[model samples]
Target: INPKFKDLRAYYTKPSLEFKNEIGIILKKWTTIRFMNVVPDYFIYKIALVGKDDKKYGEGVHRNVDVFVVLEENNYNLEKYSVGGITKSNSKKVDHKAGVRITKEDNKGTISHDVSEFKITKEQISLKELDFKLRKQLIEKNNLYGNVGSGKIVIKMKNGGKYTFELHKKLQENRMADVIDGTNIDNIEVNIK
Candidate 1:
């Protein structure tokens, strides 16, 4: 298997036990949590404190806000991850089948729109099966490209869950294409538009 493939397989499988404990503390207030590895060194944790109709914070206050916490990994130390910052947004829209859309307006009146489509499996497969499929796809899609720095992996778990450590060098080398190669499994698929 490709080294990067191996790494990501391990990530979705074993995950980071140490980080889980720390992450639990940060996510205690939220019932729903989603992980987005939007970049090589960071994991963005998106959480919801209340439902769309909940008025816990009162009306006209964006009670549907979603909180995103940025977690960064130390460059010098591979698996040492830490919280970087926190951001909140109420502009996100989600549809289990259609996908997720987020729109934002800047201070200068510029509007930014982003969409991500999710290709979820019809049947839930074991984590081990998911790893195998991703590995097979990575090997077949290995095209050998460069100068690709940004990559993403969005992980959604229903009440339960789970990187390898070696992909760090390849990620830093800007070989994201060779690393991920648009990898997806029976669990979920993320496509940014």
Candidate 2:
């Protein structure tokens, strides 16, 4: 719900489930690379490529397919927490560490956790940068198309300003419901079961 996952599709193929106490990823692996960061080297932000899939599973239509971080190493603790360790980890052991919680959206499977105090340094990158499989998913979900796959990049500027660059090509039933998101604004669209 906070800054989101990255489109880390290139790291894996097929559906592979990798779980950490903090973050959970399905179908793709996440990477920590200097080349991934695009900001000032002291910042961080959520990156992801989600698609509408509510029709198949109980999960929502626009499910987040993959995620990862795009920030310099020095910024976040980026420490791994075990789902079991969560209760054991002392809050005082660190300062400015990411505050995380696990909660699921109405139907988007189960998602949990949030990060904090991270900084990023980039603007926008193309969805083509993802792995071929992820690229295919971009098409599957209509996140990306001839113009670009559905993947998108979110950036936090030096002055607390945020940026998102998208090249979406599909306008489906759900698109009219929840695709137009903005800064700190409150707008909701619900589909009844």
Candidate 3:
């Protein structure tokens, strides 16, 4: 099946009864945030803790849990189509642009879009500075029980060369995954039914 594209204010929207029931159950099970993004191929849910004027839900007040539901590539054909006026409400009248143009040759295979560019800054932390911070955190967590431990940090130098720094600590390694993650929020082990 060929993918169908629709412009803003041109597509009919309806809620599937099964999906509605499933989402309702998830909302009741978890403390979701204020907003979520739904694309054609996936649903991005930001499950976080917020003060709902009560307990058992406000525990994850600053927690961040981003979940993505990617539709399995199956017998169905789905494509994400967007417009330049996707967010600009005032510019929609001027930009009547919509619909995806797929040629016969391009339709036979996957299509790729390059939507990103980046540059890594040369600014970095030294090994001594990093070790001091790690030591401090370990002390706070009471993990300084082992002998010398070392870790490495690679930095992109301004001269287009890689600079490696070795960090030595007199602390034991802690199981961060077992506790709350400092990078993300927490982990809830799941078994898909």
Model 3 segments beyond 4 Å from truth?
1-127, 138-148, 157-160, 168-193
Arranged by TM-score with the best first, the candidates are 1, 2, 3
lDDT for each residue of candidate 2 in 1-193, tens digit (9 for 90 to 100): 1112123222222242221123222233244321111121343322222233222223122222222222222333443211100011122222221121111122333333222222111121112221222333433433233222233324333345443333232122222112211122121111111
lDDT of 1 at 1: 35
Which number leads on lDDT? Answer: 1
Q: What TM-score number comes out for model 3?
A: 0.16
lDDT of 1 by residue, 1-193 (tens): 3353454344333232111112221212222322222222364332222222122222222222222221234332324332211122223332233243333333345544554454432222222222333332332332111111113223334432212212122222111111111122212332211
Index of the highest-TM-score prediction: 1
| Candidate 1: Cα lDDT at 179 | 19
Q: What is the C-alpha RMSD, rounded to one decimal, of candidate 1?
A: 17.0
Ordered by lDDT, highest first, the candidates read 1, 2, 3
* TM-score: the better of candidates 1 and 2: 1
Residue 17's C-alpha lDDT in candidate 1?
17
Tens-place lDDT per residue, model 3, 79-166, is 3211100110121122121111111112224332211111211121122222233333322232221222234323332244432333
TM-score of each: 0.21, 0.18, 0.16
lDDT of each: 0.27, 0.24, 0.22
The residue-level lDDT of candidate 3 at 4 comes to 25
